[PDB]
Amino acid sequence: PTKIWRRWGRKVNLKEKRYAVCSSIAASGVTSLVLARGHRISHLKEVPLVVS
Amino acid sequence: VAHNNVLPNVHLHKWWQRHVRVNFSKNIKKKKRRLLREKRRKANGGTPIEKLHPIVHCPTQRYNFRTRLGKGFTFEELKGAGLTPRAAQTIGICYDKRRKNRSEESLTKNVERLLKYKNSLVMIPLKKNKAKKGIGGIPADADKNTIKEFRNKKPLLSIFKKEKNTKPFYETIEVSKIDKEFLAYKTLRRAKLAERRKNRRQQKKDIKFKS
Amino acid sequence: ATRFKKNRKKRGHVSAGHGRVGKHRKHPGGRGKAGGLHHMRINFDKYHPGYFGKVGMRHLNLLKNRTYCPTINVDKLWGLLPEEKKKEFSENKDIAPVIDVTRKGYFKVLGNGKLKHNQPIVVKARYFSSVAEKKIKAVGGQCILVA
Amino acid sequence: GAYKYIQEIWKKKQSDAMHFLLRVRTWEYRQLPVVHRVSKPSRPDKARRLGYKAIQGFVIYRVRVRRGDRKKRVKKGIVHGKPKHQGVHKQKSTRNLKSVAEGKVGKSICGNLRVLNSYWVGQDAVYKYYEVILVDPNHNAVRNNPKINWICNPVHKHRELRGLTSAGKKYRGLRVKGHLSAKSRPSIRANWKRRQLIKLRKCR
Amino acid sequence: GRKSTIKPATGIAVGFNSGHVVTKRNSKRKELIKDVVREITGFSPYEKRIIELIKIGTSASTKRSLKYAKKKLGTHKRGKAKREEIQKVVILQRR
RNA sequence: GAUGUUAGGAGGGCAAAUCCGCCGAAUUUAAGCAUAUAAUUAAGCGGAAGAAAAGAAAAUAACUAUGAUUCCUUUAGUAACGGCGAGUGAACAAGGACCAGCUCAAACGGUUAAUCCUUCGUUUGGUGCAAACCUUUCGACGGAAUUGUCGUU
RNA sequence: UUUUAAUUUAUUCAUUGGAAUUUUUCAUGUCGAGUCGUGUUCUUUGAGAUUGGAGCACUAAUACGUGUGAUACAUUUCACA
RNA sequence: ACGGACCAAGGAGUCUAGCAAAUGUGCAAGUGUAUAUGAUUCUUUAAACAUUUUACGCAUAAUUAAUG
């Protein structure tokens, strides 16, 4: 019988979480990865686009 | 048992499923507590909800060097601040009748912390522009203008926190003033060796002074 | 990760990997540490030699706070303080660092390692090893006893 | 200052006067019914040193209790069980006779009142006597009193049955603090539950 | 270990008077009630026994009195105190 | 002491997840089994609240000392208990949540019980359409109480 | 709609009692008894020459006392309540 | 030798605690931010984010019944 004391959550190292966030930002910063992810950015001027 | 494992030690030989409990509500409780204390400090109308506590030295040889917030100032330090316990407990000063000031350093430092809190206090009149001189060491009530100009100022909560201790674990001395004759290990061994007989001497001193 | 479990790959194998002859009974050797000295004695003697019996006297209530003392060895005092300050105490022969080890969180100074030759250093600690004292004095330093 | 003299006299219990007085009083109590109301506290000093006061809603009841231990409740001395449990004679009840005495009167005989305390009064071979102070929580004389009216609100019903009187505090181990009690402090069962209850965090 | 009330602690961590070097800092009614209560009550029977044992006034007699008081009262200090006060009253009535 | 269809009141039963007392096993584990374990558990009896219980040191420490209770992290599967086998197993300090202290007894007050309750009346103003409700202090009567209420600390 | 903060305004006259601290003297007062405690028996505990509780027997001292300081004692310091 | 008349649906090494090994990952004489707190976060969010320059675990030193 399923019990509520299953290991629902997980503890993730803070350093690993920060590494992952940094890497995600870097990956968002390159055109090929954003294109391969699924977005239609063929008409964007640059991938790390910033607006006023 | 088999192979090279630590011998099992699990203390689960009783009905433990009845006693298992898991804190699904840790962050929910955190939010509820934060909301409750925020509502408290919003309800008490600008008076901080914290109470001033003394700083005391932690017991035992393990935590000798560390200080922490203790429970309540003592009668001696309240008197040194010129503040009766009855009146101090009405302006956010914690007081306990159990602590005693075994050292002048603790007495002076808690007294000066009390005085800092006291002069940082600004009292609100009990009767809406009926400012009076106070009683029992409570400061005189502030006036309408100063209350008006101070209520919009950020209330400092630094005095409520335990004080940060300076970190001078590094020092510099001249090589000329180094005692090359000292024998720390020898002194330690000698003190341990002589402890028993000096306890004797103190025992006899106490007996003699008893008369 | 229940799809990585080894039982899944024995899904149609009758015995579930637990043997056709010996089978998987429930507690066929006893429960917990049952058979020690009797039929698990070889296991106990081979992997946990001194398990049975008792030695020494009883300390009725311990109070580990009384005897808690962390140790720092003599070869880490210079590494306690930052590198540019090592440099600044190094080139200047008229000053020496006074290190209150108790403040960093060690109570005893042990003597393993090698201090820098002709580099005086004053150490404050609650306890000192004799060899630690000898090395500190040998490099021209001094041990200060503190509480 | 009369109560001081009364207290010091009652501190003897072996003097000729006190011996005779106790003997005659315990003889009277033996003939009186098991639990009966008494007009005034037989020991005014001890009663008032306990919670007793002399206003309208306060009542004193004298109660006998049989001495010795009660023997196991098994039909003859059979005990179907392990030899560690065969004993039937030397079974010492955890409640003391004083607590049993206050229960005998507070359980149902006077269910309107609330037990405050009880004291000594006398002994004999087969009975221990006691007087129990009871408070009427419905009398205005106690309801309006700023003191003592703490007993009126319903969280103090049947203190003697909940082990909340002085005798209950004694036999629950609450009369000793520190390392000599340690476990009993939040109640024994609650402390055991806390100690052996296991807490698991969601994210481990 | 033992400390000292004066002569502040040495900065040493082990030994007599050790530790940090902080600067330390520092009948008319009862007996009347006793007399009246004594007059009205008297002595308990074991008090009488101890009194007569003391009145015998030998070394063996006083040893026996200490033993008897200790047995009657439990503990050694209670028995010793009882014997000593009974000796006091024996002298005070022997005058 | 009785007795009262005297006047005014209370208790009783249900409900239990949490809570407080009592009473109290065996299955089981030890590869047998008897101490031990299961377990100060299940079953049984009784008693409360929106929480209960604990609680203002006849505490801890041994330090530069802490300061009611409860709970969380930890101390710690540790000190210890145990056919020292199987197994069992705390406390202090430390970090936090919360934070609150008090009153009887005893003392003192007799140019004066200064206390308390019942019953019957009086008004002080207020929110309600109403029903009702909140404030109100001047009594009078009958009692309780010196076998001790109230005030002071 | 509930309450609950800040804000708005209070002014004249009066005597009735109380409170805190600070000056100057008295007196070191009181402080919970079949209770604590001890022995023994049973239970309970990690508590071990007994952790708590209970039954029975004995049964205290008066603050200079008595209770803790985890090994039973005697003489005794100290600390803490 | 035992089970199986037939068909459908259901049907059995899982969950938790604790230890180790293995491997991947992060940091490294340090590592893990525990409980908790803050903060224009409050559908999601019971997650994410953060932690005024000696809390605690494990490691950094062993050995002895033990004063050490």
Contacts of B163 (CB under 8 A, 6+ apart): B55, B67, B113
Resolution of the coordinates, Å: 2.4
| Closest nucleotide to the alpha carbon of C112, via C1' | H61
Q: Tell me whether residues A9 and D203 touch, CB distance under 8 A.
A: yes
Instruction: Round to whole Å and give the CA distance between D117 and D155.
Output: 17
Residue D21's region, left for phi above 0, alpha for psi from -120 to 50, else beta, is alpha
Number of H helices, E strands in chain C: 5, 6
Cα of first residue to Cα of last residue in chain D, in angstroms, is 67
Element (H, E) at D134: strand D127-135
Strand F proximity: list residues 5-24 of D with CB under 7 Å.
Answer: none
Element (H, E) at E89: helix E76-94
The structure tokens 């005189």 sit at B140
Instruction: Round to whole Å and give the CA distance between D33 and D26.
Output: 12
Name the β-bridge partners of B67: B57
Instruction: Round to whole Å and give the CA distance between B76 and C89.
Output: 46
3-state secondary structure of B34: helix
- Residue C97 half-sphere exposure toward CB, CA atoms < 13 A: 22
- The Cα-based distances of D176 to B117, D92, D116, D120, D180 in angstroms read 40, 21, 21, 22, 7
| Single-letter amino acid, residue B133 | K
Other Cβ atoms less than 10 A from the Cβ of D130: the count is 26
Query: Angle at the Cα of E37 (from E32 to E39), degrees rounded to 5?
Result: 95
| Single-letter amino acid, residue D107 | K
Contact C29, B8 (CB under 8 A): no
Element (H, E) at D99: helix D97-106
Contacts of D106 (CB under 8 A, 6+ apart): D113, D114, D115, D132, D134, D158, D159, D160, D161
Instruction: Round to whole Å and give the CA distance between B116 and C51.
Output: 61
Largest CA distance in chain E: 62
CA C28 to C1' H9, in angstroms, rounded, equals 36
Contact B170, C81 (CB under 8 A): yes
Instruction: Round to whole Å and give the CA distance between E53 and E83.
Output: 10
Instruction: Round to whole Å and give the CA distance between B60 and B32.
Output: 37
SS3 track for D163-195? CCCHHHHHHCCCCCCHHHCCCCCCCHHHHHHHH
**How was this model experimentally determined?**
cryo-EM
**Residues in chain A preceding a C-to-N separation beyond 2.5 angstroms (breaks):** none
Q: Is the CB of D181 under 7 A from strand F?
A: no
Instruction: Round to whole Å and give the CA distance between B3 and B62.
Output: 41
Instruction: Give the β-pairing of C127-128 and C108-110.
Output: parallel
Cα E94 from chain centre: 22
Contact B133, C67 (CB under 8 A): no
Q: Record the tokens describing residue D18, joined without a space.
A: 């006190």
Q: Is the CB of D182 under 7 A from strand F?
A: yes
Query: Angle at the Cα of C88 (from C84 to C93), degrees rounded to 5?
Result: 155
Instruction: Round to whole Å and give the CA distance between D167 and D118.
Output: 8
| Closest nucleotide to the alpha carbon of C57, via C1' | H65
Q: Record the tokens describing residue B186, joined without a space.
A: 């020898």
